[PDB]
Design an enzyme around this catalytic site. Structure first.
Site, PDB file in Angstrom:
ATOM      1  N   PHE A  47     -11.854   6.773  -3.813  1.00  0.00           N
ATOM      2  CA  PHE A  47     -12.820   6.468  -2.765  1.00  0.00           C
ATOM      3  C   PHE A  47     -12.454   5.200  -1.990  1.00  0.00           C
ATOM      4  O   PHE A  47     -13.342   4.540  -1.449  1.00  0.00           O
ATOM      5  CB  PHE A  47     -14.247   6.377  -3.320  1.00  0.00           C
ATOM      6  CG  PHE A  47     -14.756   7.633  -3.979  1.00  0.00           C
ATOM      7  CD1 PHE A  47     -15.122   8.735  -3.222  1.00  0.00           C
ATOM      8  CD2 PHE A  47     -14.883   7.709  -5.359  1.00  0.00           C
ATOM      9  CE1 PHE A  47     -15.591   9.891  -3.829  1.00  0.00           C
ATOM     10  CE2 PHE A  47     -15.353   8.864  -5.966  1.00  0.00           C
ATOM     11  CZ  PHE A  47     -15.706   9.954  -5.199  1.00  0.00           C
TER      12      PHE A  47
ATOM     13  N   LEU B  66      -2.215  14.038  -1.022  1.00  0.00           N
ATOM     14  CA  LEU B  66      -2.767  13.496   0.213  1.00  0.00           C
ATOM     15  C   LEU B  66      -3.291  12.071   0.018  1.00  0.00           C
ATOM     16  O   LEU B  66      -3.669  11.427   0.991  1.00  0.00           O
ATOM     17  CB  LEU B  66      -3.872  14.426   0.738  1.00  0.00           C
ATOM     18  CG  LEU B  66      -3.411  15.709   1.439  1.00  0.00           C
ATOM     19  CD1 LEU B  66      -2.923  16.755   0.447  1.00  0.00           C
ATOM     20  CD2 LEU B  66      -4.531  16.292   2.287  1.00  0.00           C
TER      21      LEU B  66
ATOM     22  N   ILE C 238      -3.741   4.849   4.734  1.00  0.00           N
ATOM     23  CA  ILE C 238      -3.450   5.661   5.908  1.00  0.00           C
ATOM     24  C   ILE C 238      -3.449   4.833   7.196  1.00  0.00           C
ATOM     25  O   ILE C 238      -3.154   5.367   8.262  1.00  0.00           O
ATOM     26  CB  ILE C 238      -4.353   6.917   6.007  1.00  0.00           C
ATOM     27  CG1 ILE C 238      -5.675   6.683   6.752  1.00  0.00           C
ATOM     28  CG2 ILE C 238      -4.547   7.589   4.655  1.00  0.00           C
ATOM     29  CD1 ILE C 238      -6.597   5.646   6.141  1.00  0.00           C
TER      30      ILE C 238
ATOM     31  N   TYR D 287       3.793   1.438   6.813  1.00  0.00           N
ATOM     32  CA  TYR D 287       3.207   2.735   6.508  1.00  0.00           C
ATOM     33  C   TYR D 287       4.259   3.833   6.655  1.00  0.00           C
ATOM     34  O   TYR D 287       4.442   4.648   5.750  1.00  0.00           O
ATOM     35  CB  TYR D 287       1.982   3.016   7.384  1.00  0.00           C
ATOM     36  CG  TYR D 287       1.483   4.440   7.333  1.00  0.00           C
ATOM     37  CD1 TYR D 287       0.679   4.891   6.295  1.00  0.00           C
ATOM     38  CD2 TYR D 287       1.811   5.338   8.337  1.00  0.00           C
ATOM     39  CE1 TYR D 287       0.226   6.202   6.252  1.00  0.00           C
ATOM     40  CE2 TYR D 287       1.363   6.647   8.311  1.00  0.00           C
ATOM     41  CZ  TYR D 287       0.567   7.083   7.266  1.00  0.00           C
ATOM     42  OH  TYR D 287       0.122   8.374   7.263  1.00  0.00           O
TER      43      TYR D 287
HETATM   44  N1  LIG Z   1      -5.201  11.787   9.767  1.00  0.00           N
HETATM   45  C1  LIG Z   1      -4.019  11.864  10.366  1.00  0.00           C
HETATM   46  O1  LIG Z   1      -3.882  11.802  11.587  1.00  0.00           O
HETATM   47  C2  LIG Z   1      -2.800  12.036   9.493  1.00  0.00           C
HETATM   48  C3  LIG Z   1      -1.573  12.429  10.036  1.00  0.00           C
HETATM   49  C4  LIG Z   1      -0.426  12.351   9.270  1.00  0.00           C
HETATM   50  C5  LIG Z   1      -0.526  11.971   7.952  1.00  0.00           C
HETATM   51  N2  LIG Z   1      -1.739  11.819   7.352  1.00  0.00           N
HETATM   52  C6  LIG Z   1      -1.804  11.766   5.860  1.00  0.00           C
HETATM   53  O2  LIG Z   1      -2.758  12.712   5.411  1.00  0.00           O
HETATM   54  C7  LIG Z   1      -3.317  12.282   4.151  1.00  0.00           C
HETATM   55  C8  LIG Z   1      -4.824  12.364   4.236  1.00  0.00           C
HETATM   56  O3  LIG Z   1      -5.287  11.431   5.240  1.00  0.00           O
HETATM   57  P1  LIG Z   1      -6.727  11.599   5.930  1.00  0.00           P
HETATM   58  O4  LIG Z   1      -6.553  11.622   7.413  1.00  0.00           O
HETATM   59  O5  LIG Z   1      -7.489  12.693   5.260  1.00  0.00           O
HETATM   60  O6  LIG Z   1      -7.399  10.192   5.558  1.00  0.00           O
HETATM   61  P2  LIG Z   1      -8.432   9.809   4.401  1.00  0.00           P
HETATM   62  O7  LIG Z   1      -8.465   8.323   4.280  1.00  0.00           O
HETATM   63  O8  LIG Z   1      -9.708  10.545   4.662  1.00  0.00           O
HETATM   64  O9  LIG Z   1      -7.693  10.468   3.153  1.00  0.00           O
HETATM   65  C9  LIG Z   1      -6.954   9.666   2.204  1.00  0.00           C
HETATM   66  C10 LIG Z   1      -7.628   9.824   0.866  1.00  0.00           C
HETATM   67  O10 LIG Z   1      -6.801   9.220  -0.163  1.00  0.00           O
HETATM   68  C11 LIG Z   1      -7.628   8.478  -1.026  1.00  0.00           C
HETATM   69  N3  LIG Z   1      -6.848   7.428  -1.671  1.00  0.00           N
HETATM   70  C12 LIG Z   1      -6.324   6.309  -1.072  1.00  0.00           C
HETATM   71  N4  LIG Z   1      -5.706   5.511  -1.908  1.00  0.00           N
HETATM   72  C13 LIG Z   1      -5.848   6.131  -3.141  1.00  0.00           C
HETATM   73  C14 LIG Z   1      -5.424   5.773  -4.435  1.00  0.00           C
HETATM   74  N5  LIG Z   1      -4.761   4.650  -4.712  1.00  0.00           N
HETATM   75  N6  LIG Z   1      -5.741   6.611  -5.453  1.00  0.00           N
HETATM   76  C15 LIG Z   1      -6.427   7.728  -5.175  1.00  0.00           C
HETATM   77  N7  LIG Z   1      -6.875   8.163  -3.999  1.00  0.00           N
HETATM   78  C16 LIG Z   1      -6.552   7.315  -3.008  1.00  0.00           C
HETATM   79  C17 LIG Z   1      -8.737   7.939  -0.129  1.00  0.00           C
HETATM   80  O11 LIG Z   1      -9.863   7.464  -0.839  1.00  0.00           O
HETATM   81  C18 LIG Z   1      -9.009   9.157   0.759  1.00  0.00           C
HETATM   82  O12 LIG Z   1      -9.988  10.041   0.225  1.00  0.00           O
HETATM   83  C19 LIG Z   1      -2.730  10.885   3.889  1.00  0.00           C
HETATM   84  O13 LIG Z   1      -1.618  10.933   3.002  1.00  0.00           O
HETATM   85  C20 LIG Z   1      -2.298  10.443   5.291  1.00  0.00           C
HETATM   86  O14 LIG Z   1      -1.277   9.460   5.207  1.00  0.00           O
HETATM   87  C21 LIG Z   1      -2.884  11.783   8.123  1.00  0.00           C
HETATM   88  O1  LIG Z   2     -10.195   2.671  19.623  1.00  0.00           O
HETATM   89  C1  LIG Z   2      -9.087   3.198  19.709  1.00  0.00           C
HETATM   90  C2  LIG Z   2      -8.261   3.597  18.607  1.00  0.00           C
HETATM   91  C3  LIG Z   2      -7.069   4.162  18.846  1.00  0.00           C
HETATM   92  N1  LIG Z   2      -6.597   4.379  20.116  1.00  0.00           N
HETATM   93  C4  LIG Z   2      -5.287   5.014  20.344  1.00  0.00           C
HETATM   94  O2  LIG Z   2      -5.275   6.259  19.683  1.00  0.00           O
HETATM   95  C5  LIG Z   2      -3.945   6.542  19.178  1.00  0.00           C
HETATM   96  C6  LIG Z   2      -4.011   6.949  17.725  1.00  0.00           C
HETATM   97  O3  LIG Z   2      -4.351   5.807  16.903  1.00  0.00           O
HETATM   98  P1  LIG Z   2      -5.010   6.055  15.463  1.00  0.00           P
HETATM   99  O4  LIG Z   2      -6.142   7.015  15.602  1.00  0.00           O
HETATM  100  O5  LIG Z   2      -5.285   4.742  14.813  1.00  0.00           O
HETATM  101  O6  LIG Z   2      -3.821   6.777  14.666  1.00  0.00           O
HETATM  102  P2  LIG Z   2      -2.299   6.382  14.355  1.00  0.00           P
HETATM  103  O7  LIG Z   2      -2.211   4.912  14.136  1.00  0.00           O
HETATM  104  O8  LIG Z   2      -1.441   6.975  15.420  1.00  0.00           O
HETATM  105  O9  LIG Z   2      -2.030   7.111  12.949  1.00  0.00           O
HETATM  106  C7  LIG Z   2      -2.706   8.278  12.559  1.00  0.00           C
HETATM  107  O10 LIG Z   2      -1.875   9.412  12.732  1.00  0.00           O
HETATM  108  C8  LIG Z   2      -0.678   9.406  11.924  1.00  0.00           C
HETATM  109  C9  LIG Z   2       0.048  10.689  12.246  1.00  0.00           C
HETATM  110  O11 LIG Z   2       1.300  10.800  11.592  1.00  0.00           O
HETATM  111  C10 LIG Z   2      -1.036   9.304  10.457  1.00  0.00           C
HETATM  112  O12 LIG Z   2       0.156   9.267   9.688  1.00  0.00           O
HETATM  113  C11 LIG Z   2      -1.910   8.096  10.200  1.00  0.00           C
HETATM  114  O13 LIG Z   2      -2.316   8.071   8.836  1.00  0.00           O
HETATM  115  C12 LIG Z   2      -3.131   8.157  11.095  1.00  0.00           C
HETATM  116  O14 LIG Z   2      -3.977   7.026  10.910  1.00  0.00           O
HETATM  117  C13 LIG Z   2      -3.090   5.310  19.516  1.00  0.00           C
HETATM  118  O15 LIG Z   2      -2.303   5.546  20.675  1.00  0.00           O
HETATM  119  C14 LIG Z   2      -4.129   4.209  19.761  1.00  0.00           C
HETATM  120  O16 LIG Z   2      -3.712   3.257  20.713  1.00  0.00           O
HETATM  121  C15 LIG Z   2      -7.336   4.022  21.231  1.00  0.00           C
HETATM  122  O17 LIG Z   2      -6.947   4.205  22.375  1.00  0.00           O
HETATM  123  N2  LIG Z   2      -8.549   3.448  20.955  1.00  0.00           N
END
Ligand SMILES: NC(=O)c1ccc[n+]([C@@H]2O[C@H](COP(=O)([O-])OP(=O)(O)OC[C@H]3O[C@@H](n4cnc5c(N)ncnc54)[C@H](O)[C@@H]3O)[C@@H](O)[C@H]2O)c1
Ligand SMILES: O=c1ccn([C@@H]2O[C@H](COP(=O)(O)OP(=O)(O)O[C@H]3O[C@H](CO)[C@@H](O)[C@H](O)[C@H]3O)[C@@H](O)[C@H]2O)c(=O)[nH]1
Ligand SMILES: NC(=O)c1ccc[n+]([C@@H]2O[C@H](COP(=O)([O-])OP(=O)(O)OC[C@H]3O[C@@H](n4cnc5c(N)ncnc54)[C@H](O)[C@@H]3O)[C@@H](O)[C@H]2O)c1
Ligand SMILES: O=c1ccn([C@@H]2O[C@H](COP(=O)(O)OP(=O)(O)O[C@H]3O[C@H](CO)[C@@H](O)[C@H](O)[C@H]3O)[C@@H](O)[C@H]2O)c(=O)[nH]1
EC number: 5.1.3.2
Lengths: 312, 312
Positions: free
Chosen positions: A33, A77, A81, A146
């Site tokens: 969490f 997952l 993040i 990251y």
């Molecule tokens: N959301 C995006 O745009 C995006 C895109 C590319 C990659 N990812 C990857 O997808 C996965 C899921 O991300 P999300 O968008 O659902 O975000 P999220 O924060 O909702 O999901 C991450 C989850 O991992 C859990 N977690 C974090 N550290 C932990 C630990 N030490 N032990 C156990 N659980 C832990 C968090 O509590 C959370 O529930 C991540 O690996 C993230 O890097 C997300």
């Molecule tokens: O208030 C805000 C927040 C973000 N952005 C823009 O939105 C884009 C996306 O930013 P954000 O939503 O923080 O995501 P990223 O930093 O690009 O990373 C996300 O997307 C990745 C995709 O690979 C994942 O790996 C990461 O975990 C996830 O947080 C960027 O261009 C930011 O400049 C804005 O314009 N306004």
């Protein structure tokens, strides 16, 4: 099959849990969490095919957990993040994302797990790439801690594959959005814009707001996880995105259209670690997994805004 | 200039310290004596140009140390070095080799360090490669956790280079041997063979003894470190080896000849994690650094046996 999902209480993770249960699998969810939310899982309370474990991948006895539950596939997952957080504290990001992955792999190889499906970062691992849309053949070139940790995670799993024959595939999403994404998260722009515009609170872009991303809907990402969990795409990374670029400014306009009201964000200074452009070539996933995104941005935004509006 | 050497109490580290002092630099050595020995540095006790700090890179306040000593170049040789140990405990190996490197980089980027020279593992990072001798252009394909952590280290430093402009180069040696290498462990075959044969103790090779490595003398490796410490070869990895394969059996014969002892090793089972072949293309180091190995195996081995014969 028996599946284990780390980060199961999270945005993508809880969505994947629901999909696997629908598909007839038994699921163990694991989360500490850090950023996940219990409400994402609360509907599962009475489902005997689901078990939740509150655990930190950095320190928990993963060997014991996997020995008990004997998952056939582990969907990994759980991660730190936030790109900006990784800059603030690269050590912590590395502990969760690299060490956590290593401990999970070491547990998995001892407990009869068939395959780990890793979550990489298609959106960040290539850094400033040599071309757009960026194919998996492009070299990784991370420009944030990251991104580096995600690459390191891939490599460690590839290593365990050689060492022990523990199969692995890397799902590398672009920018994922949709229902259950934290409106109060530090990341997740679609969620941020939607929540703020619904509440009539200020919105901001960074830089001149020209920075672009590839926005892919959660349900499409979840489908890719399912497809790659079988004995296919072994040893490989798959870019999971749309292959379409959307600027910070253009996204604001789309979300404003869906919410209604004004389309006038503030402009704030750029953030160290963030890339200028991101767009993924999704050809490999199509050819190898038969995967294609179903949800276009306009539709996904409508869905997401509606979700936030209802929960708001 | 001001230089700091992590792993300074070790085999390569202490040799590098000596060279840097001879080149007129002030040197801070840093070590936790995990595998290094104070005896490797004891001759420096009265040298005002040398300062020693006892510290574990995983947990020590590296920021404070660098803020105090203000190195221009950090030579990063502190690592878990044993491939089999990395198989037995990949978490520990990852903690020292990845987390340790990340923390050092985070410290260095804050204290005005010009360049970090990383120590990779040319001998293992390519895994089973596409060709021998193996150029730096070949993909990394680690097949032990040790190799994976070395690759991850490179990637993180490349990341800090993008992020902060903290310069880095990666010295990637093959199998280093020579005076000061510890003979009492399971790694460092030349030292193991030399001391055992001098002492009349049993020796062994693994599998059928046909595994090959590329044996490069310590002084040659040290010269590469010095050469790359300048603003030369920024961002690059350099294979540091001889480009010649010697089998375990052939090595034993070479050491037995130098000692003037029997050439009758025992044959023990294979070691999980160990590659079958290792040979480096050293063209890039020649071109960029003007570096070539001077010491042929026969001569290096002689000098290694002498070290054990003259040892206090
Ligand atoms: N959301 C995006 O745009 C995006 C895109 C590319 C990659 N990812 C990857 O997808 C996965 C899921 O991300 P999300 O968008 O659902 O975000 P999220 O924060 O909702 O999901 C991450 C989850 O991992 C859990 N977690 C974090 N550290 C932990 C630990 N030490 N032990 C156990 N659980 C832990 C968090 O509590 C959370 O529930 C991540 O690996 C993230 O890097 C997300
Ligand atoms: O208030 C805000 C927040 C973000 N952005 C823009 O939105 C884009 C996306 O930013 P954000 O939503 O923080 O995501 P990223 O930093 O690009 O990373 C996300 O997307 C990745 C995709 O690979 C994942 O790996 C990461 O975990 C996830 O947080 C960027 O261009 C930011 O400049 C804005 O314009 N306004
Ligand atoms: N010897 C080879 O064949 C070879 C070739 C390629 C790579 N390398 C690399 O060269 C470097 C030096 O290896 P070596 O052959 O001199 O072995 P070594 O064991 O003599 O040197 C490693 C040194 O690092 C120190 N160290 C380990 N963990 C530490 C920690 N957490 N904090 C502080 N100090 C710590 C040890 O005490 C030791 O003095 C390592 O990075 C190794 O991976 C060695
Ligand atoms: O008693 C012994 C010990 C080793 N060997 C053989 O000697 C070779 C070298 O083994 P070892 O000395 O354990 O070194 P490596 O495992 O090859 O790794 C070394 O060389 C790498 C080159 O990059 C470095 O990264 C590592 O830190 C360093 O330990 C192998 O083929 C072994 O089979 C024997 O025949 N008998």
């Amino acid at each position: 099959m028996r599946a284990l999902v780390t980060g199961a209480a999270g945005f993508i993770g809880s969505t994947l849990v629901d999909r696997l249960l629908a598909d007839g699998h038994s699921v163990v969810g694991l989360d500490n969490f850090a950023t996940g939310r219990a409400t994402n899982l609360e509907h599962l309370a009475d489902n005997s095919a689901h078990v939740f474990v509150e655990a930190d991948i950095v320190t928990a006895d993963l060997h014991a957990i996997l020995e008990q539950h004997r998952p056939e596939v582990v969907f990994h997952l759980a991660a730190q993040i936030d790109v900006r957080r990784s800059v603030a504290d690269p050590q912590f990001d590395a502990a969760v994302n690299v060490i956590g992955t290593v401990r999970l792999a070491e547990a998995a190889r001892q407990t009869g797990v068939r395959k780990i499906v890793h979550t990489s970062s298609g959106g960040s691992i290539y850094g400033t790439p040599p071309e757009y849309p960026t194919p998996e053949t492009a070299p990784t070139d991370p420009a944030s801690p990251y991104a580096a940790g995600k690459v390191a995670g891939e490599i460690y799993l590839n290593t365990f594959r050689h060492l022990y024959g523990l199969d692995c595939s890397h799902i590398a999403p672009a920018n994922v959005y949709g229902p259950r994404q934290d409106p109060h998260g530090e990341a997740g722009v679609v969620a941020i814009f939607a929540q703020a515009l619904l509440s009539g609170k200020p919105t901001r872009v960074f830089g001149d707001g020209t920075n672009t991303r590839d926005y892919v809907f959660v349900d499409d990402v979840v489908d890719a996880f399912v497809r790659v969990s079988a004995d296919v795409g072994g040893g490989l990374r798959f870019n999971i995105g749309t292959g379409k670029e959307t600027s910070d400014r253009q996204l604001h306009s789309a979300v404003a259209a869906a919410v209604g009201g004004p389309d006038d964000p503030e402009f704030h200074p750029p953030r160290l670690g963030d890339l200028k452009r991101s767009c993924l070539d999704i050809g490999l996933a199509e050819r190898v997994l038969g995967w294609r995104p179903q949800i276009e941005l306009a539709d996904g935004v409508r869905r997401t805004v509606e979700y936030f509006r209802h929960k708001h």
